[PDB]
Symmetry: D2
Subunit: 266 residues, 4 copies
Amino acid sequence: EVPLPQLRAYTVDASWLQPMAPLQIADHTWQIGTEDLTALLVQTPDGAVLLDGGMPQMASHLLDNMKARGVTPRDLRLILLSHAHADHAGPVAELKRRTGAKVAANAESAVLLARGGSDDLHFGDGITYPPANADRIVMDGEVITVGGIVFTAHFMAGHTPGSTAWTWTDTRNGKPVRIAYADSLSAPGYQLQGNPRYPHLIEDYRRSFATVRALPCDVLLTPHPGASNWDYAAGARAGAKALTCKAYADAAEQKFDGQLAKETAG
Amino acid sequence: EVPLPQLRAYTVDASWLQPMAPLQIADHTWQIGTEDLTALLVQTPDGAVLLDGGMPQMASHLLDNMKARGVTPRDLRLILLSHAHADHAGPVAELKRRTGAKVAANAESAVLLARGGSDDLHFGDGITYPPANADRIVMDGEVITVGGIVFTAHFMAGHTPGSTAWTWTDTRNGKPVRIAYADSLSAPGYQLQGNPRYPHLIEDYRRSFATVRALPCDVLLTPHPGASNWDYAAGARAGAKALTCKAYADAAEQKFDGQLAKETAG
Amino acid sequence: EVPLPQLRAYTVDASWLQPMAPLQIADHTWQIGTEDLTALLVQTPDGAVLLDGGMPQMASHLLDNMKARGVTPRDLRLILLSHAHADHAGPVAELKRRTGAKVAANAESAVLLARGGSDDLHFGDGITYPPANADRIVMDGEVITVGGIVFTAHFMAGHTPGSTAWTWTDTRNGKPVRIAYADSLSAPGYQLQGNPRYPHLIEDYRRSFATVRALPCDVLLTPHPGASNWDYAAGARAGAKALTCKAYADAAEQKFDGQLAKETAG
Amino acid sequence: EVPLPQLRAYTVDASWLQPMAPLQIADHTWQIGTEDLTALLVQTPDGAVLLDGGMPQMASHLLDNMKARGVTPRDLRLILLSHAHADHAGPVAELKRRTGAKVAANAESAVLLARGGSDDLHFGDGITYPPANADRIVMDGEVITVGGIVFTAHFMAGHTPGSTAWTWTDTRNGKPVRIAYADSLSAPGYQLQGNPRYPHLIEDYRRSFATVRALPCDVLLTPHPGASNWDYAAGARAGAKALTCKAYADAAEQKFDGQLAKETAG
Ligand SMILES: C[C@@H]1[C@H]([C@H](C(=O)O)[C@@H](C)O)N=C(C(=O)O)[C@H]1SC1CN(C2=NCCS2)C1
Ligand SMILES: C[C@@H]1[C@H]([C@H](C(=O)O)[C@@H](C)O)N=C(C(=O)O)[C@H]1SC1CN(C2=NCCS2)C1
Ligand SMILES: C[C@@H]1[C@H]([C@H](C(=O)O)[C@@H](C)O)N=C(C(=O)O)[C@H]1SC1CN(C2=NCCS2)C1
Ligand SMILES: C[C@@H]1[C@H]([C@H](C(=O)O)[C@@H](C)O)N=C(C(=O)O)[C@H]1SC1CN(C2=NCCS2)C1
Ligand SMILES: [Zn+2]
Ligand SMILES: [Zn+2]
Ligand SMILES: [Zn+2]
Ligand SMILES: [Zn+2]
Ligand SMILES: [Zn+2]
Ligand SMILES: [Zn+2]
Ligand SMILES: [Zn+2]
Ligand SMILES: [Zn+2]
């Protein structure tokens, strides 16, 4: 006779958990996560910003890389998120306990973060992480300024209701670089059509493709580097093959249209 | 020499606080609030739904009117909201403590409700009420069903980010009546253009006028009855002069355009 | 070269997950959990109370057993907890989404429940579950009444800060039965002396042994049945060997004193 | 005919709202609130701590006084509280939005703070303020260290369940000064005996008198300065008449015994 199943751990490809040393993207912007998960540190004369943290077990590695960059825990002022799933917001709660960092996020992301990814529209309770509270709620198009770096929120609902692209301007070789950190546009295993928990899912994705296509975007980065053709392990060539925001949006839309057609058939 | 000012109470016109007996709108739908604030009770064989509660001091009156209708505290199953300002969601926290009711709301409304209306985009902390937590988060177009009455959420952001119209079909004289409880479309004292806390405010209002115009709408009701030309004190004629949803949206848009032109001049 | 470790699932002995049919304890009190985790249903003419839910994956089984007892989801009015660890409060969030149930708990338990067991004083983030909010905060000695069954909270901090014994009087063979659901008194792997996160841990445990010893206690039940010598699989003899509250407190204190002496040596 | 009453503002004696310039208590400790409400700034080489903020309208004044002391908003690292009523925790939410400050509090205080003082055990919803979330939960006797100043929490439940005395050691004229910031011990209009929302109220107060009596206490300060015979407007003599912790506890207990005897008679 038969017990209920044991809880299943959220396991991921090893490369998503492979620590790397900081990789510079522009004068004040560094990739400090793992080989296959983005976590961006932006260092300013007035403290540091982190965009995403990756998986829940990455907190100590992130703090190690911050220290290597000259950022102590007090100096971390702000955490921003692409979306509040466990592989991107995983260590946010712990980072808040261990640093000076406060979280800014939109209402949708704040609600999902506050329940630790539980009651997900598509995953249920299958992929959870430690819950965290947001200190500031942002609206679409709102700006946050740290040490003179101006971050702009661009809502791009679909992958989660609260999915956000964050843009800012850094410098490189003397010139401005408009960086776009665009969120995921995948729909992994999602019911797209007639989903009772997300009735306008398709319309939202279509609007989000258009938003991403139009972002100020000299350099695109994504939560999974492979989605934008980054290879964080390739050193001086890590970004050489990166997609434009236009190409990223177009590729995501073509994949999405294929998934819709497969869903209608299946 | 000069102390800081005393806190100012949120005071309103007396008619907003004038209790009235239940006024029937359709076979299962009643106005149970005050003369000038809507609070709608929908009674089903499987429990009751409340849409809005009015001001914070209205909890006991609402419970009195529910009892008069045959609804005990256990029978109240669900509270829905137009928007989470103090004159519409005021008594929600107390109603939850005193009844079986759970709250369903969108993420924006849930966040504002959870802070008791504090840190409002336009009012700051000037108009607060007891905070309450939402038990269910709804997405645009999602349905909630109680005792066979199907309520549909239609997001109409503007007055607050989380403003929602709720629609359902009741019956009257043997025939279906498509009831639309459309939220406020006012912008009282708001900075409309270039508002850093709400950069897309104007676009959202314009989309919301179009949403309201298109609602299924045999009978329109609004949080302030006068906004839809209801007179709750007029008895058998209370709804005689009510606007259509199309006329309500058109009047709100004309007022909004006037306010924009005045803001540009002022 | 070496990736960070994968997340580890919270796995438990199979018997903790082995469904059982409802086992009657007294006229209105039933064990409805698994062979080795207590979840008590108390059925009243005015709805049902659940004390604990067990592991997170037990929600559907609990609802199955409630249905077998004549308790539909609307009829479940109240969830009470021994303490907010994953093997006792695991399915509370899901039960709230799927039933009419509201949670009453003390402040300590509410705070831990709201973070899903994360940032535990002793376990860190190693044993988490879906977070849930409390609808009512109770103080020590406060009573909650459902359908004429009066439940009294007796704080017994130690195993967690918010650990609580719940007592009530049922009937059996015509006579009153004072039931005591006393919380765990274990300290599994805990640093007892000089713990910076719990400086008064030892004093709290000692006071809690005295509280448990003095409870009104014709029948003792515990979150792990074996702690009170219950065998839920033994049918008509399931409770035959149960400890008194006095014996349970004495055995817990002797174990605790042994652990203290081992900690001093180790 | 008769409308429901208007909401009543929480108004206080003018002296509670009378700004004062910073008054030094010891080498790193300053009173920066108003004439009749304590708000203590402790400045360290590693940032500043605030103990209490006073009334909700005091945020800007507090920030003015911090700036005068050389403390910018980024430098404020920690807010601690005596208890979470509106005249002591009033501006905490706003201070969090406007500074780097994180809140540490016990579970009881965190729960009350998170509901903005609503559903108070004795005041109901009559005295509310903007809700705020705690970033760290502290246990009795736990220490928090900022820039080498060690703050110790001493729970003294009664006035609120979460009432806390905070102690630390500063210096003055070359010598250590053990400062005790002991919470209120009043019971204003409280039902003391047989209170269903606080059954152990009397026992808690009695234990709290003993806690206060025993604190390390070269200098006592209290949330209302008059309770410890401080006169913040008396300049160089402001603290001359201050009570010892022993005298404060004794006076509070004598008042409490008188109130008990009056309650029995009334
Ligand atoms: C299932 C993935 C995971 C998931 C989530 O967050 O939804 C978490 C909960 O496991 N993250 C994803 C995302 O898009 O963020 C999805 S798609 C994945 C990334 N892929 C690539 N293929 C080639 C270049 S990268 C496929
Ligand atoms: C200032 C109003 C108030 C406010 C809010 O909620 O914003 C609360 C916080 O005081 N509620 C309003 C709403 O639109 O809901 C606004 S407009 C008011 C209703 N009016 C009518 N004129 C004629 C027919 S009704 C003017
Ligand atoms: C490690 C156990 C577990 C743990 C917790 O809640 O702390 C969760 C997080 O895995 N639950 C326990 C409790 O006391 O509740 C502890 S002790 C366990 C019960 N035991 C018995 N031995 C014989 C008769 S029963 C040993
Ligand atoms: C009613 C007071 C107020 C109240 C609270 O916090 O309970 C808030 C909500 O208005 N604060 C108090 C406290 O003890 O903190 C109580 S007693 C007050 C202070 N008194 C003195 N008399 C002489 C020297 S000071 C009488
Ligand atoms: Zn995702
Ligand atoms: Zn992902
Ligand atoms: Zn409003
Ligand atoms: Zn209004
Ligand atoms: Zn436990
Ligand atoms: Zn256990
Ligand atoms: Zn007080
Ligand atoms: Zn006070």
